[PDB]
Design an enzyme around this catalytic site. Sequence first.
Site, PDB file in Angstrom:
ATOM      1  N   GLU B  59       0.814  -1.222   0.000  1.00 54.86           N
ATOM      2  CA  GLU B  59       0.000   0.000   0.000  1.00 54.86           C
ATOM      3  C   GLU B  59       0.861   1.292   0.000  1.00 54.86           C
ATOM      4  N   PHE B 121     -10.302  -7.146  15.174  1.00 52.91           N
ATOM      5  CA  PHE B 121      -9.440  -7.681  14.117  1.00 52.91           C
ATOM      6  C   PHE B 121      -9.150  -6.630  13.031  1.00 52.91           C
ATOM      7  N   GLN B 122      -7.864  -6.385  12.745  1.00 54.36           N
ATOM      8  CA  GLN B 122      -7.434  -5.383  11.749  1.00 54.36           C
ATOM      9  C   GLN B 122      -8.013  -3.983  11.972  1.00 54.36           C
ATOM     10  N   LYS B 171     -17.023  -1.071   7.333  1.00 54.30           N
ATOM     11  CA  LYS B 171     -17.586  -2.077   6.458  1.00 54.30           C
ATOM     12  C   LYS B 171     -19.122  -2.124   6.457  1.00 54.30           C
ATOM     13  N   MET B 492      24.487  10.012   0.436  1.00 65.15           N
ATOM     14  CA  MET B 492      24.238  11.292   1.090  1.00 65.15           C
ATOM     15  C   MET B 492      24.631  11.208   2.565  1.00 65.15           C
TER      16      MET B 492
HETATM   17  C1  LIG Z   1      18.537  15.623   0.194  1.00 59.16           C
HETATM   18  C2  LIG Z   1      17.637  16.848  -0.078  1.00 59.16           C
HETATM   19  C3  LIG Z   1      18.268  18.073  -0.329  1.00 59.16           C
HETATM   20  C4  LIG Z   1      17.504  19.217  -0.600  1.00 59.16           C
HETATM   21  N1  LIG Z   1      18.156  20.407  -0.848  1.00 59.16           N
HETATM   22  C5  LIG Z   1      17.407  21.415  -1.439  1.00 59.16           C
HETATM   23  C6  LIG Z   1      18.075  22.592  -2.066  1.00 59.16           C
HETATM   24  O1  LIG Z   1      19.299  22.687  -2.042  1.00 59.16           O
HETATM   25  N2  LIG Z   1      17.296  23.553  -2.646  1.00 59.16           N
HETATM   26  C7  LIG Z   1      15.931  23.455  -2.679  1.00 59.16           C
HETATM   27  O2  LIG Z   1      15.249  24.299  -3.214  1.00 59.16           O
HETATM   28  N3  LIG Z   1      15.296  22.357  -2.068  1.00 59.16           N
HETATM   29  C8  LIG Z   1      16.033  21.336  -1.463  1.00 59.16           C
HETATM   30  N4  LIG Z   1      15.353  20.272  -0.902  1.00 59.16           N
HETATM   31  C9  LIG Z   1      13.914  20.296  -0.924  1.00 59.16           C
HETATM   32  C10 LIG Z   1      13.322  21.161   0.240  1.00 59.16           C
HETATM   33  O3  LIG Z   1      13.397  20.417   1.438  1.00 59.16           O
HETATM   34  C11 LIG Z   1      11.804  21.529  -0.029  1.00 59.16           C
HETATM   35  O4  LIG Z   1      11.127  20.385  -0.341  1.00 59.16           O
HETATM   36  C12 LIG Z   1      11.641  22.456  -1.219  1.00 59.16           C
HETATM   37  O5  LIG Z   1      12.655  23.455  -1.261  1.00 59.16           O
HETATM   38  C13 LIG Z   1      10.315  23.152  -1.160  1.00 59.16           C
HETATM   39  O6  LIG Z   1      10.203  23.885  -2.359  1.00 59.16           O
HETATM   40  P1  LIG Z   1       8.901  24.806  -2.549  1.00 59.16           P
HETATM   41  O7  LIG Z   1       8.830  25.861  -1.468  1.00 59.16           O
HETATM   42  O8  LIG Z   1       8.900  25.430  -3.927  1.00 59.16           O
HETATM   43  O9  LIG Z   1       7.631  23.829  -2.498  1.00 59.16           O
HETATM   44  P2  LIG Z   1       6.543  23.605  -1.378  1.00 59.16           P
HETATM   45  O10 LIG Z   1       7.171  22.963  -0.157  1.00 59.16           O
HETATM   46  O11 LIG Z   1       5.410  22.734  -1.960  1.00 59.16           O
HETATM   47  O12 LIG Z   1       5.921  25.025  -0.974  1.00 59.16           O
HETATM   48  C14 LIG Z   1       5.067  25.687  -1.934  1.00 59.16           C
HETATM   49  C15 LIG Z   1       4.517  26.936  -1.252  1.00 59.16           C
HETATM   50  O13 LIG Z   1       3.711  27.591  -2.235  1.00 59.16           O
HETATM   51  C16 LIG Z   1       2.365  27.679  -1.709  1.00 59.16           C
HETATM   52  N5  LIG Z   1       1.432  27.469  -2.755  1.00 59.16           N
HETATM   53  C17 LIG Z   1       0.954  26.295  -3.197  1.00 59.16           C
HETATM   54  N6  LIG Z   1       0.075  26.520  -4.191  1.00 59.16           N
HETATM   55  C18 LIG Z   1      -0.037  27.876  -4.375  1.00 59.16           C
HETATM   56  C19 LIG Z   1      -0.771  28.752  -5.221  1.00 59.16           C
HETATM   57  N7  LIG Z   1      -1.656  28.255  -6.172  1.00 59.16           N
HETATM   58  N8  LIG Z   1      -0.582  30.083  -5.121  1.00 59.16           N
HETATM   59  C20 LIG Z   1       0.245  30.595  -4.233  1.00 59.16           C
HETATM   60  N9  LIG Z   1       0.954  29.812  -3.401  1.00 59.16           N
HETATM   61  C21 LIG Z   1       0.842  28.474  -3.459  1.00 59.16           C
HETATM   62  C22 LIG Z   1       2.287  26.612  -0.670  1.00 59.16           C
HETATM   63  O14 LIG Z   1       1.233  26.874   0.287  1.00 59.16           O
HETATM   64  C23 LIG Z   1       3.648  26.642  -0.062  1.00 59.16           C
HETATM   65  O15 LIG Z   1       3.801  27.672   0.965  1.00 59.16           O
HETATM   66  C24 LIG Z   1      16.109  19.143  -0.607  1.00 59.16           C
HETATM   67  C25 LIG Z   1      15.469  17.903  -0.322  1.00 59.16           C
HETATM   68  C26 LIG Z   1      16.241  16.762  -0.073  1.00 59.16           C
HETATM   69  C27 LIG Z   1      15.513  15.430   0.215  1.00 59.16           C
HETATM   70  C1  LIG Z   2      -6.607 -14.414   8.771  1.00 62.34           C
HETATM   71  C2  LIG Z   2      -6.592 -14.536  10.310  1.00 62.34           C
HETATM   72  C3  LIG Z   2      -7.456 -15.471  10.895  1.00 62.34           C
HETATM   73  C4  LIG Z   2      -7.475 -15.639  12.287  1.00 62.34           C
HETATM   74  N1  LIG Z   2      -8.334 -16.573  12.831  1.00 62.34           N
HETATM   75  C5  LIG Z   2      -8.089 -16.953  14.143  1.00 62.34           C
HETATM   76  C6  LIG Z   2      -8.714 -18.183  14.708  1.00 62.34           C
HETATM   77  O1  LIG Z   2      -9.472 -18.859  14.018  1.00 62.34           O
HETATM   78  N2  LIG Z   2      -8.433 -18.524  16.001  1.00 62.34           N
HETATM   79  C7  LIG Z   2      -7.587 -17.778  16.778  1.00 62.34           C
HETATM   80  O2  LIG Z   2      -7.326 -18.098  17.915  1.00 62.34           O
HETATM   81  N3  LIG Z   2      -7.015 -16.603  16.255  1.00 62.34           N
HETATM   82  C8  LIG Z   2      -7.254 -16.201  14.940  1.00 62.34           C
HETATM   83  N4  LIG Z   2      -6.642 -15.052  14.476  1.00 62.34           N
HETATM   84  C9  LIG Z   2      -5.829 -14.298  15.393  1.00 62.34           C
HETATM   85  C10 LIG Z   2      -6.686 -13.356  16.303  1.00 62.34           C
HETATM   86  O3  LIG Z   2      -7.071 -12.227  15.550  1.00 62.34           O
HETATM   87  C11 LIG Z   2      -5.860 -12.862  17.563  1.00 62.34           C
HETATM   88  O4  LIG Z   2      -4.664 -12.366  17.132  1.00 62.34           O
HETATM   89  C12 LIG Z   2      -5.529 -13.998  18.513  1.00 62.34           C
HETATM   90  O5  LIG Z   2      -6.617 -14.905  18.661  1.00 62.34           O
HETATM   91  C13 LIG Z   2      -5.193 -13.461  19.872  1.00 62.34           C
HETATM   92  O6  LIG Z   2      -4.781 -14.569  20.640  1.00 62.34           O
HETATM   93  P1  LIG Z   2      -4.426 -14.310  22.185  1.00 62.34           P
HETATM   94  O7  LIG Z   2      -5.629 -13.776  22.929  1.00 62.34           O
HETATM   95  O8  LIG Z   2      -3.906 -15.581  22.820  1.00 62.34           O
HETATM   96  O9  LIG Z   2      -3.210 -13.265  22.213  1.00 62.34           O
HETATM   97  P2  LIG Z   2      -3.171 -11.734  22.593  1.00 62.34           P
HETATM   98  O10 LIG Z   2      -3.937 -10.919  21.571  1.00 62.34           O
HETATM   99  O11 LIG Z   2      -1.697 -11.289  22.687  1.00 62.34           O
HETATM  100  O12 LIG Z   2      -3.839 -11.547  24.037  1.00 62.34           O
HETATM  101  C14 LIG Z   2      -3.118 -12.043  25.187  1.00 62.34           C
HETATM  102  C15 LIG Z   2      -3.908 -11.623  26.422  1.00 62.34           C
HETATM  103  O13 LIG Z   2      -3.195 -12.161  27.539  1.00 62.34           O
HETATM  104  C16 LIG Z   2      -2.809 -11.054  28.387  1.00 62.34           C
HETATM  105  N5  LIG Z   2      -1.517 -11.291  28.919  1.00 62.34           N
HETATM  106  C17 LIG Z   2      -0.336 -10.993  28.355  1.00 62.34           C
HETATM  107  N6  LIG Z   2       0.658 -11.361  29.184  1.00 62.34           N
HETATM  108  C18 LIG Z   2       0.101 -11.884  30.325  1.00 62.34           C
HETATM  109  C19 LIG Z   2       0.568 -12.427  31.554  1.00 62.34           C
HETATM  110  N7  LIG Z   2       1.929 -12.523  31.823  1.00 62.34           N
HETATM  111  N8  LIG Z   2      -0.321 -12.885  32.457  1.00 62.34           N
HETATM  112  C20 LIG Z   2      -1.619 -12.811  32.243  1.00 62.34           C
HETATM  113  N9  LIG Z   2      -2.114 -12.295  31.104  1.00 62.34           N
HETATM  114  C21 LIG Z   2      -1.289 -11.845  30.142  1.00 62.34           C
HETATM  115  C22 LIG Z   2      -2.833  -9.859  27.495  1.00 62.34           C
HETATM  116  O14 LIG Z   2      -2.975  -8.632  28.249  1.00 62.34           O
HETATM  117  C23 LIG Z   2      -3.997 -10.135  26.605  1.00 62.34           C
HETATM  118  O15 LIG Z   2      -5.280  -9.756  27.195  1.00 62.34           O
HETATM  119  C24 LIG Z   2      -6.642 -14.865  13.099  1.00 62.34           C
HETATM  120  C25 LIG Z   2      -5.786 -13.895  12.504  1.00 62.34           C
HETATM  121  C26 LIG Z   2      -5.759 -13.749  11.112  1.00 62.34           C
HETATM  122  C27 LIG Z   2      -4.806 -12.697  10.501  1.00 62.34           C
END
Ligand SMILES: Cc1cc2nc3c(=O)[nH]c(=O)nc-3n(C[C@H](O)[C@H](O)[C@H](O)COP(=O)(O)OP(=O)(O)OC[C@H]3O[C@@H](n4cnc5c(N)ncnc54)[C@H](O)[C@@H]3O)c2cc1C
Ligand SMILES: Cc1cc2nc3c(=O)[nH]c(=O)nc-3n(C[C@H](O)[C@H](O)[C@H](O)COP(=O)(O)OP(=O)(O)OC[C@H]3O[C@@H](n4cnc5c(N)ncnc54)[C@H](O)[C@@H]3O)c2cc1C
Lengths: 597, 597, 217
Positions: B59, B121-122, B171, B492
């Site tokens: 992602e 979950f998630q 969801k 760098m």
């Molecule tokens: C390793 C490294 C080295 C770097 N060294 C340099 C360097 O030497 N020189 C350099 O320039 N940069 C350098 N940078 C990049 C720097 O950190 C900034 O990202 C960059 O300078 C920002 O440029 P900017 O102000 O034009 O853009 P932005 O950060 O996007 O700022 C744009 C500004 O314009 C405003 N604005 C946006 N749209 C409009 C609009 N329609 N009308 C009016 N205002 C608007 C915004 O609100 C903002 O205040 C480096 C980056 C890295 C990773």
């Molecule tokens: C695709 C998928 C499918 C899943 N399906 C299942 C399934 O079918 N069955 C299943 O079991 N899981 C499943 N899970 C996992 C599930 O979501 C949980 O992660 C899992 O069940 C948690 O198990 P747990 O309670 O033992 O562990 P934990 O989430 O770590 O909970 C442990 C608990 O014990 C407590 N604890 C920790 N240390 C101590 C201690 N020293 N003394 C006392 N208490 C303590 C903690 O505070 C906590 O309340 C699935 C996950 C995925 C990704």
Amino acid sequence: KEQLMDDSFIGLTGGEIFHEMMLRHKVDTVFGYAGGAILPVFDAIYNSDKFKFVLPRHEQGAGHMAEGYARASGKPGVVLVTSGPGATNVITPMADALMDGVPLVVFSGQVPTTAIGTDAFQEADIVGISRSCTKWNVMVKNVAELPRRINEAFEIATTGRPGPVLVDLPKDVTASILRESIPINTTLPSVSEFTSEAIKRAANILNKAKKPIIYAGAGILNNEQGPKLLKELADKANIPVTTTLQGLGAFDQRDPKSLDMLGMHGSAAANTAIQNADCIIALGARFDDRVTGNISKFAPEAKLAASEGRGGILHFEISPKNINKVVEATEAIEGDVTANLQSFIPLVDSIENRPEWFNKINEWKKKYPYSYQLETPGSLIKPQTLIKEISDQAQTYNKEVIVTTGVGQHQMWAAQHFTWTQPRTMITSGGLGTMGYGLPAAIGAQVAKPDAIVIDIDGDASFNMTLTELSSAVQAGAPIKVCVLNNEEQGMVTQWQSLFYEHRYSHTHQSNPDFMKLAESMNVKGIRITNQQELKSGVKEFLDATEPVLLEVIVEKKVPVLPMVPAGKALDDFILWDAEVEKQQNDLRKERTGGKY
Amino acid sequence: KEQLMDDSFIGLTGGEIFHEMMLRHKVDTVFGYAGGAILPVFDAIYNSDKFKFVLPRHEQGAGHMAEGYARASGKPGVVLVTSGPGATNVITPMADALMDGVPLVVFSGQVPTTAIGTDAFQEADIVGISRSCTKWNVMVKNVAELPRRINEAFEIATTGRPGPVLVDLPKDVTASILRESIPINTTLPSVSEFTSEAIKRAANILNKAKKPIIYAGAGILNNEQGPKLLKELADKANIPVTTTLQGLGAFDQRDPKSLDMLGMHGSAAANTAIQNADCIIALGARFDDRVTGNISKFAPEAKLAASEGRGGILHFEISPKNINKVVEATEAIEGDVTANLQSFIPLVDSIENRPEWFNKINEWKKKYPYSYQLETPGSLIKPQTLIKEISDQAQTYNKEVIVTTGVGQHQMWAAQHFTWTQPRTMITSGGLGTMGYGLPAAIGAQVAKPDAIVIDIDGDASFNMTLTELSSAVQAGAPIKVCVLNNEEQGMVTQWQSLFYEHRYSHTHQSNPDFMKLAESMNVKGIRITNQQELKSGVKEFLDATEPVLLEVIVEKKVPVLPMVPAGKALDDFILWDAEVEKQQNDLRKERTGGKY
Amino acid sequence: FEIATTGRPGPVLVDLPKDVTASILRESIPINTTLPSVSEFTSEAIKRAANILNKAKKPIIYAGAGILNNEQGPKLLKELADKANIPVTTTLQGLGAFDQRDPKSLDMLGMHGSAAANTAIQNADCIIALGARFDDRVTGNISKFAPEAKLAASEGRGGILHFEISPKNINKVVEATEAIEGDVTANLQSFIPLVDSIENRPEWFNKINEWKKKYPY
Ligand SMILES: Cc1cc2nc3c(=O)[nH]c(=O)nc-3n(C[C@H](O)[C@H](O)[C@H](O)COP(=O)(O)OP(=O)(O)OC[C@H]3O[C@@H](n4cnc5c(N)ncnc54)[C@H](O)[C@@H]3O)c2cc1C
Ligand SMILES: Cc1cc2nc3c(=O)[nH]c(=O)nc-3n(C[C@H](O)[C@H](O)[C@H](O)COP(=O)(O)OP(=O)(O)OC[C@H]3O[C@@H](n4cnc5c(N)ncnc54)[C@H](O)[C@@H]3O)c2cc1C
Ligand SMILES: Cc1cc2nc3c(=O)[nH]c(=O)nc-3n(C[C@H](O)[C@H](O)[C@H](O)COP(=O)(O)OP(=O)(O)OC[C@H]3O[C@@H](n4cnc5c(N)ncnc54)[C@H](O)[C@@H]3O)c2cc1C
Ligand SMILES: COC(=O)c1ccccc1CS(=O)(=O)NC(=O)Nc1nc(OC)cc(OC)n1
Ligand SMILES: COC(=O)c1ccccc1CS(=O)(=O)NC(=O)Nc1nc(OC)cc(OC)n1
Ligand SMILES: C/C(NCc1cnc(C)nc1N)=C(/S)CCOP(=O)([O-])OP(=O)([O-])O
Ligand SMILES: C/C(NCc1cnc(C)nc1N)=C(/S)CCOP(=O)([O-])OP(=O)([O-])O
Ligand SMILES: [K+]
Ligand SMILES: [K+]
Ligand SMILES: [Mg+2]
Ligand SMILES: [Mg+2]
């Protein structure tokens, strides 16, 4: 006063102080990646012989590696990254660690205090961003407080329910030099009557139970004596044991009292048993919504027993937040489950036999195996069969075997079809469920346990997420074993699309690289199993390898993980495997997709 | 009343409503990745012919692709991901988009409203986590408000300073069906006297100036007429033009009035000119701390002129937050710079010649070229030379040429040594500075502009961060051109370690894969240039390719980007390239590292 | 208590759940928790600040609440004003930091301050800001504030010398020509000995006395 203050850090930079505190906290491994804001710390740890430094290709990699390390070792995983994107890249691993209770200590560089809040170069508000995915975090504001904040971080990460913490390190703080003495306590790391009575009441309840069951989870793994005391309890009171996904390995599944995993994709025997039990002993498990099924329909017999004063739910939980959060505990036993078990077991009556309960238990286990459609002549390898093959061959070596996974069907099949026997051998993303976890977790576990066999059972889509870390395994000297189950699909999502969206596969087929050429490019051994007749010898070559190795296995596509408790259903209202049903489903899928799937 | 309410969405699911609103907002491309919580939306967009869907491998990839798309096209980049880790994985691209002013509309699935706050979950608190890296975000709570929230998101993303927004989609909301009519306004998308007087005062100030300079940035690119009006102003009042990194391409660098890029690694001629100018016209630029050098020592002559009523800083800025944030504006002209230029220029006096100012300008340009150590017999290719070769050959095609980069030395050399002539052709992470940006940004830009040549000038460590997205380019049909400058170092950071940490290279050498085998594994053409005699023909093969292609170039290691204004120094207090100094530095590095570097 | 009273003083809150305050301590605790409790950079800034003041022909002290936070504050303020012969204006919150009976007193500046104080700060070539934060009731229109001090800064003969303990309030409203970070009273002890003693400023005090006479309350 001189006895309470310490001058020994005077003259050191914040970076040097960081280095010394890592040593005092017995950190032997740091996972991290450099950048401008964290340079003063990288300069201080330059060529350190005090710990191993592991360099990933991406900071997400460092994060998941540190998680794998922590889950394998029982020690906190330490991460060191730069400001801005180095810090935001650790957000997913932090949220992951929080959901799964993993002790992570994340150190992120920050722009100088003088530039904070100015939209500075590589400035993120990481304290704000990570608030909700850490147990605690802090920005260090001067070097005199750096040792206290480091102590605080390690203490919070590892106490209560373990979890992630973040310490933000502005560049001017880590470059500055300590000029003043600091309290000496900051330069060093480190049963209520109420609970005692709850324990006694809990024992009296269990001593009445005629259908007890232990529901054991991750918490039991957090003490080395946990699994021992779990077995001692199950043996004394003659109680069947089921575990969560995260509790896998807490109990020897070879034991007749093992009910295997419960939950959405757990054994129908385990699910049936917990729905019929009059007493549920919840040991270090949080009643997650993948486990309980429909909450209002969960554990009916235990709720009835509680109301009639002859059973209920006995919840041993360390975090008060998770007590009475999902289900009402009949007795809440607060604190470390292993410590509280030492008090509990002697009050529990020894029971020789439970003939009718175990008659039911044994009947359920017999009728509810993890059944699936076996290979037929010419068919692809079934993924369930592959897992069994790996499990059977891995146990032949005289080495510990640790399994990590990605997220999806392969993960559930690994959980179901491996035989789990040892604690801290299942390292899997459960609460957040992060695809891409498997490979970096394996590297971290392999570093924690260099004499272990470490196997990443991975999905092809999951593996694609973070496959760049293969180079990291080679550079770290971690001989991990990656098995990609290649069904060429996001199988867990296509499973839901088949079942609930009439075989409408919306964007769930990502194209894969050539995994053998990829392995070669990463300087990793590659093995490819394409047919049934290559399975045994290919898995043997995989496990016999003494270098990092990527195994690709071509497996059957569009096959569901069963049993399954669909969303909204009671735990004992599950879909089971049926051969004829699968055949009909295949025909229907073929017709609906015009033969594409 | 019937005229003000709309019933046309009644009976549609939230997912279907989402789909229809994408169409009404003229979205032609969506970047995203499926998962359980976002399934109702993926089911609604299944086989849509209304927009192109682009599937990354991660992602983060979707996020940076959408950024590249938005910067190439001027349209918002739309992202669609699942809950939990799908959402947290977009945090770095959101923080990136915020810092660089990129219009991003992120749609993240969420667990059902009934499960929010239960550690489901998630489940991530993405609204809390992304608060600080979005302009605005919201969780939709019922399907009746879904069209209003989508309108709000697109409007906020694209107005004022453009930036990222996030809309969280539970969801049960996206699966629910609209049962009630909704206000018809929600089913469709969409000069003060104060400013007018400021514009007049600004013109009067410029008409007094004897040493004016235009400092132009990204804001001028946000209107198609921007570059035209910039040229019209520079031509009328005879004013030299410097740009930021993000303003590159706003002005034709071939024009004699071009001072090139200013800042930390900008031209010493541009830096000298702005330090000596009596009037600075800041057009859509925010005075970032990579540009200003030491703030208290910045623009001394303009500050003096302001105090004496004969010059100063004229700041055309759309976001009030960035007015008087870093430097005091003598006149603040609030609003769109292009619109306000239409009013400004007619009040500005036409100027034929500025003999003494341009005598100084031309002398500075002559004495401050981007000098570096040229190739010698047998030496590796210099990275500065490679960039020049790419720039010279790319301009031979009858196609637009868009450049994206990673982050590091290669990025600065691309900025310096390319000849920039067209708007929206430099797509680079500047404010957050995210390594790994280059490849996914290129894919997004290539999708926006399918007839363009799109070149990712990348570093080897940056490329390693997200190289899995090569498969994504193939699957999307995006024939991007990736050039990896392989110096086998995080150049760098080693540059800073050489200069400020006595050649102590602390963890800044990651091992690389075989890039040619990697390309092959990803089904991408591979070219490798290893010596000077392969440079020309290899770059030609690269640019002539009509398919995705990865070019690896072996380049000189441990060479600094110069000029450089070190931290703490005034803009005109720069380090310049010197041949003898470089030679001494090489000898010192060799001695200090025992010949390792 | 430490946070409340250090840096810029301010409020803190400690939330006390009833079960915590009713519970009984059962374990030992670190003994440090049972008891309460000049950089080269700043030293150089102080020297540069003195050199600037020693050039000034129209100095003014703008003193605020910060000078009250040390018992020696008012004493050192008087010592500086007396040594370098400088008129003193205060904020509302600095009232009482300087004896208003003293001929060098310009009274309060700002929205409702003396027109003599306001005129003097608009014409001063050097402004010594002692424990004051340039609030928007004091500065008037910020872009038009202290024109003569800004000009002097640009010409290298004056500007704004800001003695401030909180970095957040340095360069927040107005650009300091020199920022002297830390406790104003402590930093004044270093500053004053580097400041030249001045006997008379006839034209500046002629203006000051004319303004006081024409702008009474
Ligand atoms: C390793 C490294 C080295 C770097 N060294 C340099 C360097 O030497 N020189 C350099 O320039 N940069 C350098 N940078 C990049 C720097 O950190 C900034 O990202 C960059 O300078 C920002 O440029 P900017 O102000 O034009 O853009 P932005 O950060 O996007 O700022 C744009 C500004 O314009 C405003 N604005 C946006 N749209 C409009 C609009 N329609 N009308 C009016 N205002 C608007 C915004 O609100 C903002 O205040 C480096 C980056 C890295 C990773
Ligand atoms: C695709 C998928 C499918 C899943 N399906 C299942 C399934 O079918 N069955 C299943 O079991 N899981 C499943 N899970 C996992 C599930 O979501 C949980 O992660 C899992 O069940 C948690 O198990 P747990 O309670 O033992 O562990 P934990 O989430 O770590 O909970 C442990 C608990 O014990 C407590 N604890 C920790 N240390 C101590 C201690 N020293 N003394 C006392 N208490 C303590 C903690 O505070 C906590 O309340 C699935 C996950 C995925 C990704
Ligand atoms: C109706 C009304 C009208 C007002 N009109 C006026 C007016 O005309 N004139 C006027 O002056 N005020 C006026 N005010 C008050 C004004 O709003 C501010 O409250 C006031 O001016 C702030 O004064 P100060 O900067 O001295 O104090 P503070 O706001 O307390 O600021 C003190 C500064 O000194 C710093 N500091 C603190 N301790 C130390 C230390 N030990 N060393 C160094 N620095 C330190 C602080 O960090 C801070 O930056 C008015 C208020 C009201 C209600
Ligand atoms: C990371 O930025 C900062 O730490 C920062 C941000 C705002 C203000 C001041 C700083 C400290 S700094 O100006 O000295 N830059 C710095 O520490 N590192 C630094 N590293 C580079 O590559 C290693 C390249 C580079 O600018 C291109 N800056
Ligand atoms: C994503 O989780 C949720 O949306 C959720 C979370 C908490 C409570 C309820 C839900 C909705 S759900 O129980 O119906 N599960 C769901 O929507 N998707 C779902 N997808 C899977 O793979 C596609 C696998 C899987 O559990 C292993 N759940
Ligand atoms: C897309 C998705 N889940 C949503 C999702 C999206 N993005 C992330 C980072 N994580 C998750 N969990 C899954 S489980 C498919 C996994 O496919 P796979 O790795 O090939 O495994 P398998 O085919 O065995 O199910
Ligand atoms: C580590 C680092 N910067 C810190 C850093 C860390 N992590 C991330 C995600 N982004 C950044 N910007 C750089 S610039 C090195 C880049 O190395 P490169 O991609 O090979 O480029 P080059 O060698 O040309 O400088
Ligand atoms: K099993
Ligand atoms: K150029
Ligand atoms: Mg798969
Ligand atoms: Mg490199």
